[PDB]
Amino acid sequence: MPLHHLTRFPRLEFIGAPTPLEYLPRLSDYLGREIYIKRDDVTPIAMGGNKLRKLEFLVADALREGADTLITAGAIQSNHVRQTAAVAAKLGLHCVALLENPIGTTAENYLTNGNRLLLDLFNTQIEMCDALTDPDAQLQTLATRIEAQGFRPYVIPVGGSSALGAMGYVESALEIAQQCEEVVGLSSVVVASGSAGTHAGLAVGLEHLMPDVELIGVTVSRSVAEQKPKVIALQQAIAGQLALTATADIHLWDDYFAPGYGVPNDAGMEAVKLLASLEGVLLDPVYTGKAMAGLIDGISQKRFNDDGPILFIHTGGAPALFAYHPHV
Amino acid sequence: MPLHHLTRFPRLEFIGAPTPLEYLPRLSDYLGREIYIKRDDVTPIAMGGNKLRKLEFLVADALREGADTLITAGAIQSNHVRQTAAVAAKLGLHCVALLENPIGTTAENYLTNGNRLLLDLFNTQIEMCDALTDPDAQLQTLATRIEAQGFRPYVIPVGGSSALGAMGYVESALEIAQQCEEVLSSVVVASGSAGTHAGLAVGLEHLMPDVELIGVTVSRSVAEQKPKVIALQQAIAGQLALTATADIHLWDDYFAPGYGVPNDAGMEAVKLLASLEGVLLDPVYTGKAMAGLIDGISQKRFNDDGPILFIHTGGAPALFAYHPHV
Ligand SMILES: [Cl-]
Numbered sequence: 001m002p003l004h005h006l007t008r009f010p011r012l013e014f015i016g017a018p019t020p021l022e023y024l025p026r027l028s029d030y031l032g033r034e035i036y037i038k039r040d041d042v043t044p045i046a047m048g049g050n051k052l053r054k055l056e057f058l059v060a061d062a063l064r065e066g067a068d069t070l071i072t073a074g075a076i077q078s079n080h081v082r083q084t085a086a087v088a089a090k091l092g093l094h095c096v097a098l099l100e101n102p103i104g105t106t107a108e109n110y111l112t113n114g115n116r117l118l119l120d121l122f123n124t125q126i127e128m129c130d131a132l133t134d135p136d137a138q139l140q141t142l143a144t145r146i147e148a149q150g151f152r153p154y155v156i157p158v159g160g161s162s163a164l165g166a167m168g169y170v171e172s173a174l175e176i177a178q179q180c181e182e183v184v185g186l187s188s189v190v191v192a193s194g195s196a197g198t199h200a201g202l203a204v205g206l207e208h209l210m211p212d213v214e215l216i217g218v219t220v221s222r223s224v225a226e227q228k229p230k231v232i233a234l235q236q237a238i239a240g241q242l243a244l245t246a247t248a249d250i251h252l253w254d255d256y257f258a259p260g261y262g263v264p265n266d267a268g269m270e271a272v273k274l275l276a277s278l279e280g281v282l283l284d285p286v287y288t289g290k291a292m293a294g295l296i297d298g299i300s301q302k303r304f305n306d307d308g309p310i311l312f313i314h315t316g317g318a319p320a321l322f323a324y325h326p327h328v
Numbered sequence: 329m330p331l332h333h334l335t336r337f338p339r340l341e342f343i344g345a346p347t348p349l350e351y352l353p354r355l356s357d358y359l360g361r362e363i364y365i366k367r368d369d370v371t372p373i374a375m376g377g378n379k380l381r382k383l384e385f386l387v388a389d390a391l392r393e394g395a396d397t398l399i400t401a402g403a404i405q406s407n408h409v410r411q412t413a414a415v416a417a418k419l420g421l422h423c424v425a426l427l428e429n430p431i432g433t434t435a436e437n438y439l440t441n442g443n444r445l446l447l448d449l450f451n452t453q454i455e456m457c458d459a460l461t462d463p464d465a466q467l468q469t470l471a472t473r474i475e476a477q478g479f480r481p482y483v484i485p486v487g488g489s490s491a492l493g494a495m496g497y498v499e500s501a502l503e504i505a506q507q508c509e510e511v512l513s514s515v516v517v518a519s520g521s522a523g524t525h526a527g528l529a530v531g532l533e534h535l536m537p538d539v540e541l542i543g544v545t546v547s548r549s550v551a552e553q554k555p556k557v558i559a560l561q562q563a564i565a566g567q568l569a570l571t572a573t574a575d576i577h578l579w580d581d582y583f584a585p586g587y588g589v590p591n592d593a594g595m596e597a598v599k600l601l602a603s604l605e606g607v608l609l610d611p612v613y614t615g616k617a618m619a620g621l622i623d624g625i626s627q628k629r630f631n632d633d634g635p636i637l638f639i640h641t642g643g644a645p646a647l648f649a650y651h652p653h654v
Binding site: 016017020026039042044045046047085086087088089090092109112113114117118121122123272273276277278279280281282318319321322325326 | 344345348350354367370372373374375413414415416417418420436437440441442445446449450451598599602603604605606607608644645647648649651652
């Protein structure tokens with residue numbers, strides 16, 4: 001009932017049915033407590049991911065206003081850009097991608113394999129830049145150039161993280177609540193926290209549907225101090241758009257992303273190897289590997305509010321495995 | 329139900345809900361033909377694919393025999409080996425893979441990226457062989473060796489293609505029949521180790537007898553492939569207490585110069601589906617099968633001009649192994 005103003009926003013159907021919520025018996029056995037996983041990595045469009053939930057709302061908005069071109073930005077190995085380009089192809093929309101190399105790698109698989117390979121298959125127009133120092137401004141400059149060609153552009157921010165995009169994860173929280181109902185008494189939820197839309201959406205949804213559940217964001221690019229205001233801003237904007245209040249404190253752990261965004265670390269790699277070998281589940285070196293390392297250490301250090309079941313949100317990212325191999 | 333004997337087989341749930349069956353409006357508009365797609369590339373385990381449907385029955389059997397190890401075989405970039413290894417990891421079973429390099433490549437991505445990379449993640453024990461000249465025999469030798477080493481192995485044949493494995497594609501046919509009540513003249517599928525083709529053959533005979541099932545070969549001529557598909561067709565039907573009289577249809581014009589080697593038509597089919605529908609095919613299987621489908625249109629090769637259903641059997645992780653070239 002409380003999230004009913006969600007039905008107001010037009011949305012396209014890219015996912016279909018609720019994604020699986022699975023128990024992880026072998027990981028749970030190893031970690032010494034109940035771990036469940038929300039399989040948002042399993043969606044039907046071009047290798048899946050959390051970004052698709054946001055695109056359901058963003059692209060419906062684009063269509064509503066008569067846009068014929070989607071413009072967005074990210075790393076060369078961005079999952080969002082790949083999912084945006086896939087959706088654009090599907091719908092016969094043009095797509096323009098402003099890409100940066102965030103880690104200064106010259107490794108050929110990072111440069112041309114994985115997500116970047118898929119972009120070419122989707123006929124994405126590629127605009128390279130030195131760095132995304134001011135993505136919102138840089139995207140508008142690009143959109144102006146594109147508009148001059150007679151295209152009707154729709155700008156999608158980095159990671160699809162606007163209040164509207166984040167509605168996708170308010171929706172995901174509904175699924176989670178219904179899937180857990182009479183099945184599992186959840187204590188904590190863990191999600192990677194990057195451009196912040198996923199975290200913020202879940203934060204609003206879970207505050208209203210499962211208020212006693214502790215939502216933990218594991219940062220992938222920023223410290224708590226830098227990240228927290230971004231998550232809060234979105235949380236409040238989302239709540240406002242839904243005619244709701246959001247009084248919950250945002251929780252973030254920033255210990256698991258060093259030496260920085262898009263750079264693999266040992267604990268991340270070990271988390272990837274653990275999920276693959278114990279559960280046959282594929283994580284990624286940029287996002288989910290790092291988020292899972294956070295979950296594991298949180299259990300190790302008793303960081304969670306209590307000992308109860310933890311739900312891991314699998315936000316996707318596996319195609320990056322092929323870009324990061326063998327190194328850099 | 330005429331297919332009642334299917335529930336008599338022990339099966340693990342690896343997939344759950346039926347996979348999507350989708351209309352492809354943009355491809356359809358471009359080809360001037362109604363095209364639908366069975367999304368068996370969207371299965372929840374380790375980047376998905378058709379092999380998982382087979383493994384539901386094969387691995388259930390493995391556990392019934394009390395096995396602790398799964399042993400199978402394929403190319404370095406085998407989708408089947410990758411899905412078997414993921415399933416073994418999930419269930420806490422050892423996995424031993426007998427791998428060959430079918431194309432003589434030394435390309436790094438073929439040798440170490442894509443499906444092969446995932447094998448390492450799943451802690452697969454890898455055994456390289458010069459050639460899978462007699463896979464069934466070579467797998468048995470390995471199994472006896474492993475059993476002598478103090479394990480309880482279960483052998484899964486190449487591509488998971490046994491009568492039991494092929495039950496997974498009788499199951500897919502039931503989904504197709506259910507989902508097509510809103511729609512069909514033809515079905516197109518890649519025909520390799522033959523379990524998918526044969527399973528669909530038996531299912532579709534009983535569920536949608538007016539539909540023409542076309543197998544596009546990915547490794548063999550019609551002469552070499554037809555007896556393999558018929559034999560499995562007959563074995564499946566026998567075990568389900570059914571008769572299978574339907575002819576097997578095969579097109580072999582679309583796989584040159586051989587298994588696991590991309591060709592231009594195949595890669596162009598990949599580009600077409602990606603750019604028109606946001607759908608990812610693969611260089612080894614689905615790209616070639618789709619190339620066949622498209623040529624079937626332009627050569628008026630189907631029995632009539634009506635809607636076509638393409639079976640997406642998966643394979644997309646191989647894109648990353650075949651890039652930039654082999
Ligand atoms: Cl332990």
